[PDB]
Every structure is written in structure tokens, then in C-alpha cells.
Design a protein around this ligand. Structure first.
Ligand SMILES: C[C@@H]1O[C@H](O)[C@@H](O)[C@H](O)[C@@H]1O
Ligand SMILES: [Ca+2]
Length: 141
């Protein structure tokens, strides 16, 4: 629930994703565990979807600052590439979007500067690539 003294508002929130494979249910990206080894149980996994995506629902409009996305680490790390992070309001209107080409480390940090949003979606832009996320943390600043 807190990471380095900052309240992670995504923790334990409802999640969905495009499909599930390998029992990589979407709630694994909000289970409080940054472990990126798939075999740990901490990491989501969709099927090879058109495209694969994952989303957290904050349950109401909230304010979104830092969003930190933790990649799978044990294998297939390149899958988390060429992707959008999209904020939606209560009526699923897009209110902000950032594109990430790839990760040089195990995570990427994005600052949405306190934009009002209820949903944060991670969407791969390449057809037929599974989406796996170790953790998605969201902070209000
Ligand atoms: C859980 C599995 O891990 C393996 O390393 C991959 O080759 C499979 O595609 C799948 O992601
Ligand atoms: Ca996790």
C-alpha cells in the first residue's frame, strides 16, 4: 500500500486484461509485489491478443501523478515494448496518453502531473504479443 512513503492507490484495486494465460490473472500487477519472475506468482500474462492490454480501475475519479510499471524479469522481457499508457475518465474518455518504446531497466516511470482519471490502461501496440506486468503502482503526485 505504501512504497517509499508514497501511497500506492492502485494496490488491491479491481483489474482486468484482454485475456489470461498461464494463470497470470490481472490482479497480480496490484498485489504489492514487484517480483518480476513469472514463476513467483507476482506477474500477469495475457494470451497473444490483438492487442494485449491490462487495466486498473481506481473506482472513482482520482488524481494521477507517478505511474511506475514493473516488467517481467525472468524471460521475454522485450514483450513490454511499443506500448501506450492511457488514462480514462469516468465515461471512458481518454484524458491522457504516453507512449513507451522500450525499457532500459526493469521498470519505467511516467508522470501524469495530477490528471484526473479513473482507469489506467497499459496497451501493447504490436499484435500477437502477450502482455506481462510484474506490478503497476500509481501515486497521486
Ligand atoms: C510463462 C511462459 O514463459 C516462457 O518463458 C515463455 O516462452 C512463454 O511464452 C510464457 O511466457
Ligand atoms: Ca505483482
Amino acid at each position: 500500500k505504501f512504497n517509499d512513503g508514497n501511497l500506492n492507490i492502485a494496490y488491491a484495486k479491481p483489474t482486468t486484461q484482454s485475456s489470461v494465460d498461464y494463470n497470470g490473472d490481472p490482479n497480480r500487477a496490484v498485489d504489492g509485489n514487484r517480483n518480476g519472475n513469472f514463476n513467483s506468482g507476482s506477474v500477469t500474462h495475457t494470451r497473444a491478443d490483438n492487442p494485449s492490454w491490462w487495466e486498473v480501475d481506481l473506482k472513482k475519479m482520482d488524481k494521477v501523478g507517478l505511474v511506475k510499471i514493473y516488467n517481467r524479469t525472468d524471460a521475454e522481457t522485450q514483450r513490454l515494448s511499443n506500448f501506450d499508457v492511457i488514462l480514462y475518465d469516468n465515461n471512458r474518455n481518454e484524458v491522457a496518453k504516453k507512449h513507451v518504446n522500450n525499457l532500459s531497466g526493469e521498470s519505467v516511470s511516467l508522470d501524469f502531473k495530477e490528471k484526473g482519471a479513473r482507469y489506467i490502461k497499459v496497451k501493447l501496440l504490436t499484435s500477437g504479443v502477450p502482455l506481462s506486468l510484474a506490478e503497476v503502482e500509481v501515486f497521486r503526485e
